[PDB]
Amino acid sequence: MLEAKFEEASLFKRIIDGFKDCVQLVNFQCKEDGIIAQAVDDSRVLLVSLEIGVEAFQEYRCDHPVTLGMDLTSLSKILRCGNNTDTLTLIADNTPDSIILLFEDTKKDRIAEYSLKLMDIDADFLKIEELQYDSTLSLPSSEFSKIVRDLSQLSDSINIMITKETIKFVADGDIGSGSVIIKPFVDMEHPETSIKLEMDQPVDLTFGAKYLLDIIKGSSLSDRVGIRLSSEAPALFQFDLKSGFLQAALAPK
Amino acid sequence: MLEAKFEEASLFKRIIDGFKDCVQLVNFQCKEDGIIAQAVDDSRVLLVSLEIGVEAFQEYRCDHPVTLGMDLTSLSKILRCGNNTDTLTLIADNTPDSIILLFEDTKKDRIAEYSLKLMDIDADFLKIEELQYDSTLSLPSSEFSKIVRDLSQLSDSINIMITKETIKFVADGDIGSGSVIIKPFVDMEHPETSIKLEMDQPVDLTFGAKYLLDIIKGSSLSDRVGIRLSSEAPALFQFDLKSGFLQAALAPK
Amino acid sequence: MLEAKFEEASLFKRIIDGFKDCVQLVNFQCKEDGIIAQAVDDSRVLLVSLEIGVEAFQEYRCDHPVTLGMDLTSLSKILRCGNNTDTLTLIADNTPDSIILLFEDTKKDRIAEYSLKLMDIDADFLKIEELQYDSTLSLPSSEFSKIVRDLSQLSDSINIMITKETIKFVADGDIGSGSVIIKPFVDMEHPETSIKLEMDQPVDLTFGAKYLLDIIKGSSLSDRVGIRLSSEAPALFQFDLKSGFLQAALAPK
């Protein structure tokens, strides 16, 4: 039986919106260790993954490894149905055909219960990460998101080129071309605005615009974003959070 | 001759928007006692009524019971044409074919006059209210509006079930089902957040989604909303204001 | 070689949006004296003009009178691609086929360079202004813009009638008619809210709605707007700024 209780429902809503437009119909898996999720879009180019630890809740309980597939559009349609200041509780049992979400106010004057009919999803999972990549950077999520949104207006292709102490974003389309160049710096005044880069091998990889625009929707989850790039493996974007992370994998071109 | 003068035009704008999407082409009637209005939509399921007393104005004057039918879309198209900090004055005469609206600033540097061509509306009125119903509740308008908006995403049918110290809102659709349960409580810390219920007979009535979504547009008129429900009579939603009220009547199913 | 450097990019963005929906594909001309621009829409009814002096920049440099035609939609698509707190630098050379825009942050951690492919525009210019008109007024830009937006809902024709100490705006359509009357006053409490009028000959001219709605988009450029009206010459709307101005010319009816 699954009895999870978030401290606040806002976290779960933001997490769902972090890859809502990325992939739909994600098959979560709940264990006694935490909640994970892995999904691939219809085009099979983006691999989105979720990990939520026990510490992200004020009270978590589980006694059966359950697998729960549901529609992200309908799930987000339900997640907006609770007063944001209330507390959210996920409820499921052994071999279920629906998941139940309980919204409770502090003094229990109102109680909202929503039942969501599940979906039959093929239980397939993918593990492709390694310990080190050709280059590894970390930059503020808002800055990276604005960079992507700026370059998406020019073309449907965004190139990233990383050399020693140099990160470059190129985009060439019909109306013209654009280039954003950032350099690593460990600023003492503000550590969060600092861009960090570890350089092992130069990188020059082209990605799509739509997939990055959907990826950057996890900007509300973290202040920073960590990108791992290698010539052989897919680019790895990662947003960290309180005992958990969202991890997108995008194949270059 | 009708010479009404609101203290501020914002009240009239909000009142028009309280049932703007409810019913269009409402035939107001102005007497020396106040301004009332009654309208039915094309489907003839929703009966919307308005009552505005003399105290809602800083200066009211009338000497002839005039009847004035006009388009709510065009009326709202005109009501946005005055500086909100100015004062609004309704002007009409005996047997008129247009109504004149006068917007005046405090120091009279600018004067805006708008003439609205009226509509020929059949003078029909309906009085169906009684003193007591099977159950009578009153709850904050924002809470009720959010409840309706939350349940409208699931289905086009919203059931309300009232039992002793229990108000329940059910909605079952394709993606799933939802239930919001509130209990009466007279909270001392905040009297406005208190939900009040008088129980004479149990109620279990299903209503539409679109009509309730249009009804709840009078949430800007009052902090609370009073709902009267009986098995025989149509459900009565009411928003009170400064010497007046908006009153919608919706037929169950 | 053209090397202009705005104090802030916000000014240039606002200036482009001041006539963005007015005319597209405007052919700027840069001299060692300043930057000017003149454009006519496809209908050839609105003549939009721009003048930007050297003092509008913190650092301007030029050694060749260059002529630069570009698309306003694409230019505005690029102007949103720089962090608003950064500084913008226009770069061009002798006989160019593209213009380069440089966005620089204060500490130079990031540098954004955008290349815009130019357009071949016939170098035609028009000078039609004179020193005096039949009537000349100046009123707050926000007030005038709201007046235009209020009257645009009634009809596609907005008449302006100016007599001694009387400015009137008429608009008669299907649903009705509207009239906004403002009077000149030199208010001591607030000089900016004052409306000023110099009266030499009475004016009664009808203009379009769409063209005025596009003209009033320069409301973000100035607190006030100066209108010059004569029976013979086109109406002249003007927004002033820090060493420069935007000047639209609209033909009456």
Swiss-Prot record, chains A, B, C:
GO cellular component terms, alphabetically, are: chromosome, telomeric region; nucleus; PCNA complex; replication fork
Concerning SUPFAM superfamilies, the annotation shows: DNA clamp (SSF55979)
- Membership in a protein family: Belongs to the PCNA family.
Subcellular location per the Swiss-Prot or TrEMBL entry:
Nucleus
Q: Which residues bind DNA?
A: 61-80
User: Which InterPro entries does the record match to this protein?
Assistant: DNA_clamp_sf, Pr_cel_nuc_antig, Pr_cel_nuc_antig_C, Pr_cel_nuc_antig_CS, Pr_cel_nuc_antig_N
UniProt cross-references to PROSITE patterns, sorted A to Z: PCNA_1, PCNA_2
Whom does it interact with, and what assembly results?
Homotrimer. Interacts with RAD30. Interacts with MCM10. Interacts with UBP10.
Sorted alphabetically, the Gene Ontology BP terms of this entry are: error-free translesion synthesis; establishment of mitotic sister chromatid cohesion; lagging strand elongation; leading strand elongation; maintenance of DNA trinucleotide repeats; meiotic mismatch repair; mismatch repair; mitotic cell cycle
Q: Which domain of life is it from?
A: Eukaryota
Please name the source species: Saccharomyces cerevisiae (strain ATCC 204508 / S288c)
What GO MF annotations does this protein's record show?
DNA binding; DNA polymerase processivity factor activity; identical protein binding
Q: What is this protein called?
A: Proliferating cell nuclear antigen
